[PDB]
């Protein structure tokens, strides 16, 4: 996490998501009266682009904190765009460094897959110790959406991928006894890619984090109960996840959405299969709990439990977000 | 390294390289008199396949040591192929575990990209403390080959990939001052893929490690001097690397080659660009040194220095094998 982020090729890959770059620039500059003559903290600034957007909006002073060697590249951009007076790059972790001054506004891009992955939100919330009571954060809130999906093609792919392990004589070795463990491992990988909304079987449930109010420790254990009103009849193969963040400015509220009804981002969307699918009729209710537990690997364990109330038919899975399947 | 190797999907990907699996089975079974009634150590056994090949050749007892959770999957295959008496799976690092007995023969697949990557050879050599003076190792020796190449398409690609950083106004930001650092980072990535032998400008130099004699500490610092006799006139853009291992049995010597004149393996071949190319005439000599320094990340820093003796024109690079470009 503090070596992968030191690569310009990584910063270049992320800056080429036009929705990400354009949405941040629009959020900041449409709300430019919220930056004019203010003090700004940029948390995990990377190449420094958000610090430049703050400068474009007339900020007085911007502290740009970056834990990786990307910080050295940022101080090169600040010197070459003639801004050393106004943008101060501070190499180090936002938890350990010193700021000479409290700030009017914190800006960051801390969203991983499914919003929480990489656990950079913990660092964004930690930075609030530097924020005046007056103060705002950009982004301001995050909504995670969950909905059940039906996708027999994706379900069956997990069996197909393991059918290597069926071989009773792979060079004289019987592999067959491991086929079930292989299936099982594939099912524990969250699937990162996009899909058509035609697969959703119910309207999404929304879980909101208010970054103005939430505290670092809220994200160690995230509990998301759901009740879906099934709009279609068939097999539910798992839950689909996406997120939206809102930049709530004085002038305007700007949304960055990773929803499958919006243009593609490099966040795609994430699907977690159940170990075995549930039959539900239109009219039935599908209820359960999604639990995200933060792990030492800077990711989450995802526990999902769902039952159809009308039948009592129940399914679950425990997925490792450290190990996604990038199907796109 | 002790989590990535715990995945069946990784074991499955490696077992599907037909040259790798077929070559190991042929080496062991053509030399079956070297295993018949013997004691065998399988170092980093993975799924356990080499332990089964030892059993196929009549070994008496095989200790199969594996540091990852793949060990639990191996004990499932041993029980299901009816071999618990003959193959003993030992979960843990070959450096820390106990064997009740010295062995006639050590078998392993410890070769990373460019042979040394992942530094598993250090563990293979460490295991020799368990080997009788009688004893053999499979594989027995490794040859690394280096040769100079000419590939203007690959050279120019490194500039093209960085031309994102030329933008004087990326959303009002001048990126141009970082273009040189970006070029530079691309040039420090070893290129993993295959190429036509038509690009080689001289016959390869061979550096041999004799695993029977070499000691763990020989691989901390590997020094490979070279003198090439240029067979073609043009720009030399860098050095190409590949390796061969030999299974030197009583009955036969079997070769596993990753050479560009042999069928493709999932080792491909590796090319390191010079920061700037050297002009050489057919008849000139290209001399220098390739130095591999082992790092904390279980990989190597690659320093390359070359000059054309006839002109004194000199080039270098320092590459990080932890960060390859997978161009295939
Ligand atoms: N993965 C994403 N974001 C998570 C954060 C990534 N990164 C944001 C980079 N910032 C930028 O690009 N800013 C420029 C930008 C932003 C938005 C639009 C345009 C440009 C986090 C940054 O914090 C750094 N750091 C880590 N821990 C820290 C600590 N404790 N203290 C201080 N710094 C710390 C770490 O080195 C790194 O530089 N985005 C993502 C993922 C998938 C797809 C897509 Br497209 C986007
Ligand atoms: N990358 C390669 N090899 C490097 C070694 C990988 N692996 C070989 C797996 N072994 C097998 O597949 N064996 C089966 C096999 C072998 C050959 C042919 C067919 C099947 C090393 C194994 O040691 C384990 N371990 C690590 N440190 C250890 C320590 N100190 N002590 C004990 N175990 C330790 C670690 O968990 C892991 O299981 N091969 C590779 C690379 C690119 C392309 C291709 Br195709 C192949």
UniProtKB/Swiss-Prot annotation, chains A, B:
Its EC number is 2.1.1.319. There is a cross-link at residue 79 (Glycyl lysine isopeptide (Lys-Gly) (interchain with G-Cter in ubiquitin)). One of its GO terms (biological process) is positive regulation of fat cell differentiation. Residues 198-231 are annotated as: Required for nuclear translocation. It catalyses: L-arginyl-[protein] + 2 S-adenosyl-L-methionine = N(omega),N(omega)-dimethyl-L-arginyl-[protein] + 2 S-adenosyl-L-homocysteine + 2 H(+). Signal peptide: none annotated. Overexpressed in prostate adenocarcinomas and high-grade prostatic intraepithelial neoplasia. The modification Phosphoserine is found at residue 68. The gene is CARM1. Methylates (mono- and asymmetric dimethylation) the guanidino nitrogens of arginyl residues in several proteins involved in DNA packaging, transcription regulation, pre-mRNA splicing, and mRNA stability. Recruited to promoters upon gene activation together with histone acetyltransferases from EP300/P300 and p160 families, methylates histone H3 at 'Arg-17' (H3R17me), forming mainly asymmetric dimethylarginine (H3R17me2a), leading to activation of transcription via chromatin remodeling. It is found in: Nucleus; Cytoplasm; Chromosome. S-adenosyl-L-methionine binds at residues 11, 20, 44, 66, 95, 123. One of its GO terms (cellular component) is cytosol. Keywords: Acetylation, Chromatin regulator, Chromosome, Cytoplasm, Host-virus interaction, Isopeptide bond, Methylation, Methyltransferase, Nucleus, Phosphoprotein, S-adenosyl-L-methionine, Transcription, Transcription regulation, Transferase, Ubl conjugation. This is Histone-arginine methyltransferase CARM1. GO terms for molecular function: beta-catenin binding; DNA-binding transcription factor binding; histone arginine N-methyltransferase activity; histone H3R17 methyltransferase activity; histone H3R2 methyltransferase activity; histone methyltransferase activity; protein methyltransferase activity; protein-arginine N-methyltransferase activity. Methylation enhances transcription coactivator activity. Methylation is required for its role in the regulation of pre-mRNA alternative splicing. Phosphorylation at Ser-68 is strongly increased during mitosis, and decreases rapidly to a very low, basal level after entry into the G1 phase of the cell cycle. Phosphorylation at Ser-68 may promote location in the cytosol. Phosphorylation at Ser-68 interferes with S-adenosyl-L-methionine binding and strongly reduces methyltransferase activity. Homodimer. Interacts with NR1H4. Interacts with SNRPC. Interacts with the C-terminus of NCOA2/GRIP1, NCO3/ACTR and NCOA1/SRC1. Part of a complex consisting of CARM1, EP300/P300 and NCOA2/GRIP1. Interacts with FLII, TP53, myogenic factor MEF2, EP300/P300, TRIM24, CREBBP and CTNNB1. Interacts with RELA. Identified in a complex containing CARM1, TRIM24 and NCOA2/GRIP1. Interacts with NCOA3/SRC3. Interacts with SKP2. Interacts (via PH domain-like fold) with C9orf72. Interacts with PARP1; promoting PARP1 recruimtent to replication forks.
